[PDB]
Design a protein around this nucleic acid. Sequence first.
RNA 1: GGCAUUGCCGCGAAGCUACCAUCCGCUGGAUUAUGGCUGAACGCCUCUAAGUCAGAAUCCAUGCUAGAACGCGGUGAUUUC
Length: 191
Amino acid sequence: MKYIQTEQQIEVPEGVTVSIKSRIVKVVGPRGTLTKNLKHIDVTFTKVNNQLIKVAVHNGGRKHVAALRTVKSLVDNMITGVTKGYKYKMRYVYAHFPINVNIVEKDGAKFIEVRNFLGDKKIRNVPVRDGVTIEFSTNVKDEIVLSGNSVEDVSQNAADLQQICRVRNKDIRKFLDGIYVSHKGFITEDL
RNA sequence: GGCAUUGCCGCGAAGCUACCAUCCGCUGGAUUAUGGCUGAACGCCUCUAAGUCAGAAUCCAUGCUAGAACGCGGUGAUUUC
Ligand SMILES: [Mg+2]
Ligand SMILES: [Mg+2]
Ligand SMILES: [Mg+2]
Ligand SMILES: [Mg+2]
Ligand SMILES: [Mg+2]
Ligand SMILES: [Mg+2]
């Protein structure tokens, strides 16, 4: 249909500064600085009042306007990650063999090490992406917590941990063992 | 010692040679299917549309062979008459 103009609003809270040169977005907040290259989308950013950015697509087709809202969501996630942070809680699930998850170092590289998954003698190692913090939750049995500014990095680190523990050659409806994301929220409570 | 078209027999070094002998046969990246992340379209959802993770005896490299006889480089010496 080639809609004349489509636009989305990105709300900027008080303690956040958004610097957008051509299509490289830098978001600065209390928790840190995030950066995203969006030169692949052909959108136009415009600051309105220092609390509102508008992102627009002119003469855009269906896919172009579909990507506009994706741009808005990505910038919103950047802002949410520098203000509230992102935290993913994963639970270990096993029928018989306890899963042994720890943090080890290889040349100072901070791997999540998984042993005894379904009795395996193989040691699985999932690197920790920079910016992601791993904390093992006390008062909850078999819970690993991944926290960070970038939802992309924390969710991909959690997904790597989940994927490393896929069951092979078994009915997965029965052999349900693995490390599964049980919660995805923010670092700051009740916000 | 000759001849017997290598006269025949045993052993027989060298050379050649046998899964009949011994040794040796490399590790990186990009991918497929697929499973995912974020994420709209479609206020939800969604691996997909933008972006993106992993991933096959695959592919391209590393490695190995040849070296273009009209591809190239470096370097030595270049004729007293
Ligand atoms: Mg079976
Ligand atoms: Mg005679
Ligand atoms: Mg004779
Ligand atoms: Mg999701
Ligand atoms: Mg795509
Ligand atoms: Mg030649």
